[PDB]
Structures are given as structure tokens and as C-alpha cells.
């Protein structure tokens, strides 16, 4: 009776946002899950490499932004950077 982490219900909620009637089968669930893991490991690995390259000890939103600009290709990069800036900015807007 342990607690294995996975992004099941999160991907599910994003799905219900973008297709309120379309379900997702457990195997495509696993695929979305491994996709989230892969992309997150890529972005954090590049953020870590940025930090160590500039001799910093903090992964701030600057490093995540440059990681996104390095990994995701052009248009995907621009739109993802916008989405992240908006989320972070909104987070700052609260308290």
C-alpha cells in the first residue's frame, strides 16, 4: 500500500480541458506519462547544465526559460516560453 507517483490525473485534467468528451486509454495514458517524464527530465537537465555552466546554484525561471528555448523547436519554443512566463507572472501576482 505505497504511493507510486505518476502524472495520470494531471494529463487527464488537461485532456478534459481540451476535449471534454474524449477519453484516453490506459496505454496512451502511459505514453503521455512517459512523455511528461521525458520532457521534464530534458528540461531540468538542460537547466542544470546552464546553472553549472554559469556557476550558479539555483535553477530559477531564467534557466528553465533558456532550457525551453534550447530544447523545443522554434514555434513550440516561443509559445511555451509565453505560457511559462504567463504562469510564473500570475504566480507572482498572488501571495
Amino acid at each position: 500500500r505505497s504511493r507510486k507517483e505518476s502524472y495520470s490525473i494531471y494529463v487527464y485534467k488537461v485532456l478534459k480541458q481540451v476535449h471534454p468528451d474524449t477519453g484516453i486509454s490506459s496505454k496512451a495514458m502511459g505514453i503521455m506519462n512517459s512523455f511528461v517524464n521525458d520532457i521534464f527530465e530534458r528540461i531540468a537537465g538542460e537547466a542544470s547544465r546552464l546553472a553549472h555552466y554559469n556557476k550558479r546554484s539555483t535553477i530559477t525561471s531564467r534557466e528553465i526559460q533558456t532550457a525551453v528555448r534550447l530544447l523545443l523547436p522554434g514555434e513550440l519554443a516561443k509559445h511555451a516560453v509565453s505560457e511559462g512566463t504567463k504562469a510564473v507572472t500570475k504566480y507572482t501576482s498572488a501571495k
Partner: protein
């Protein structure tokens, strides 16, 4: 929560725990998990949206791996992002070389 504070659906708390216990750096700015959770949620929304539509073309209300493969490989900049990724039970893009077609 803290994901609601950012208008996200992906859990900023979990992404913080993973950026911290993953040994990516000694410190993790409190604005980093938010940015990263947002980028993950954006890419997941992109994938699932293109996927959904393909499933709807196959007049189906349930995404299966084939639909993810169709979305990831038809989109040009998602292909380049997952160019070196094979998707289990994914099949390929229907593509017969024009020289092989009958004449």
C-alpha cells in the same frame, strides 16, 4: 494549493519535489517549478489536442497510442522534438513512395 495559484493543472508541488530530489542543482528557485509545470502542461495540451482531433477523424472518442503517433509525427515541430522516440503500439505514417505506385 500552489498549482491553482498559477492557473495550472500540472502539480507545481510535485514538480518542485522532483527538481529538488533529483539533484539538478543545490537550490531551486521557487519560480522554477511553476515555469516548468506550465511548459509541461502546454506541451501535454498540444499533444493531447492534436491527438484528440485525429481520434475524432477516426470517429473515435478515446485516444489510443496510434492517435498520439499520428499527432506527433504529422506536426512538424513536435516531430523534431520527439524525432528519436518510438511510441509503443504506434505504427507508422501511411506513406507509399511515389515511385512504387502503379503506372
Amino acid at each position: 494549493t500552489r498549482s491553482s495559484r498559477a492557473g495550472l493543472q500540472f502539480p507545481v508541488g510535485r514538480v518542485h519535489r522532483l527538481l529538488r530530489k533529483g539533484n539538478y542543482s543545490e537550490r531551486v528557485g521557487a519560480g522554477a517549478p511553476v515555469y516548468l509545470a506550465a511548459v509541461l502542461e502546454y506541451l501535454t495540451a498540444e499533444i493531447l489536442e492534436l491527438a484528440g482531433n485525429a481520434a475524432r477523424d477516426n470517429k473515435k472518442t478515446r485516444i489510443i497510442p496510434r492517435h498520439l503517433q499520428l499527432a506527433i509525427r504529422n506536426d512538424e515541430e513536435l516531430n523534431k522534438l520527439l524525432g528519436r522516440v518510438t511510441i509503443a503500439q504506434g505504427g507508422v505514417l501511411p506513406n507509399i513512395q511515389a515511385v512504387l505506385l502503379p503506372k
